[PDB]
Design a protein around this ligand. Structure first.
Ligand code: H01
Ligand code: MG
Length: 307
């Protein structure tokens, strides 16, 4: 049995040549002004370049198809990447599947929390393009933050981080678990996105044994509408002022890979804030394409299919 494996993600530019069109796409067609563009470029430079980041999704999708075809023998999976904000787009991935003769696919988004703006939008764009082309069906994973193998990944890293600490810090530490902020209007549709982030943080804090943790949001866009808050920078400060913590540990659980939203908005922006206040900054390794994470994903996909 052959099945397409449609792996979807937000996307990151493969080359600097694409930073401009990437950002224009995110800004819903509004082209960056030259100084904004330069600012962006400088950020990617500071984190060591854009090229490494794109490759991680490629390796994630490839490892997942491989481990999927390794662990069972009734389905042969073939992976297709479809990205929201850069080529190959979701629609081009479905088009390729159809060309290769695929009639049934399973899709998964590389974002463990369901939202209307992210997961649902991707799943719908995929299904609508399958329907336009005819004779291809897609069953879509909606959320997987609660998969135990995925909780275990983050719990072990948090445990290792607290274990590595000075004794002084362990007893005066704060866990901040976060994901990408979205327009506050999502709550008009009862979007469970904020609740699922709360549940993630609890699952991970409790598995790690952590009584003190908070949920924050990051990497918000600039629009006239309110976005989900508090932002991690304001939360880190409010927390250092209701209780004066000495170490802050950041688990960007909404992100699966090293990209700008982590390497910059956490390791720079939040680290600017901890350094200032002389609390310590910790941020454990992102899952990227480590075996333990890909196994969790394979399990999510098989569970979805009824195995
Ligand atoms: C400048 C701009 C941005 N975003 C928009 C504008 C122009 C509209 C206006 O402000 O009047 C527009 C939208 N972004 C949206 C939505 C639903 C709109 C309205 C579209 C319309 O005009 O109908 C959603 C949205 N946006 C972003 C995401 S997320 O990454 O998935 O979280 C999502 C779901 C991301 C961003 N949007 C941004 C920026 S940035 O300030 O960094 O340049 C970012 C990082 C900026
Ligand atoms: Mg920002």
């Amino acid at each position: 049995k052959k099945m397409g494996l449609l792996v979807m993600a937000y996307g990151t530019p493969y080359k600097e040549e694409d930073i401009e069109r990437y950002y224009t796409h995110i800004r819903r067609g509004r082209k960056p002004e030259p100084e904004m563009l330069q600012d962006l470029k400088d950020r990617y430079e500071a984190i060591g370049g854009i090229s490494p980041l794109a490759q991680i999704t490629e390796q994630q999708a490839h490892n997942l198809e491989q481990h999927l075809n390794e662990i069972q023998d009734e389905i042969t999976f073939k992976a297709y990447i479809g990205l929201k904000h850069i080529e190959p787009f979701i629609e081009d991935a479905v088009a390729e599947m159809h060309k290769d003769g695929i009639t049934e696919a399973v899709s998964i988004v590389l974002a463990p929390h369901f939202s209307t703006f992210s997961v649902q939008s991707y799943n719908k764009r995929a299904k609508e393009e399958a329907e336009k082309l005819g004779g291809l069906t897609i069953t879509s994973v909606e959320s997987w933050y609660d998969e135990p193998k995925f909780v275990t990944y983050w719990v072990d890293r948090v445990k290792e981080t607290y274990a590595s600490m000075p004794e002084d810090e362990r007893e005066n530490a704060m866990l901040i678990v976060s994901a990408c902020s979205l327009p506050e209007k999502i709550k008009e549709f009862g979007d469970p996105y904020p609740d699922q982030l709360h549940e993630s943080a609890k699952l991970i804090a409790e598995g790690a044994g952590v009584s003190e943790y908070a949920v924050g949001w990051q990497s918000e866009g600039n629009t006239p509408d309110p976005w989900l808050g508090p932002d991690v920078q304001d939360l880190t400060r409010d927390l250092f002022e209701q209780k004066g913590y000495q170490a802050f540990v950041y688990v960007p659980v909404g992100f699966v890979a090293d990209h700008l939203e982590v390497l910059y908005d956490n390791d720079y922006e939040c680290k600017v804030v901890t350094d200032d206040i002389g609390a310590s900054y910790y941020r454990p390794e992102m899952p990227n394409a480590k075996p333990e994470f890909i196994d969790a994903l394979a399990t999510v996909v098989l569970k979805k299919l009824g195995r």
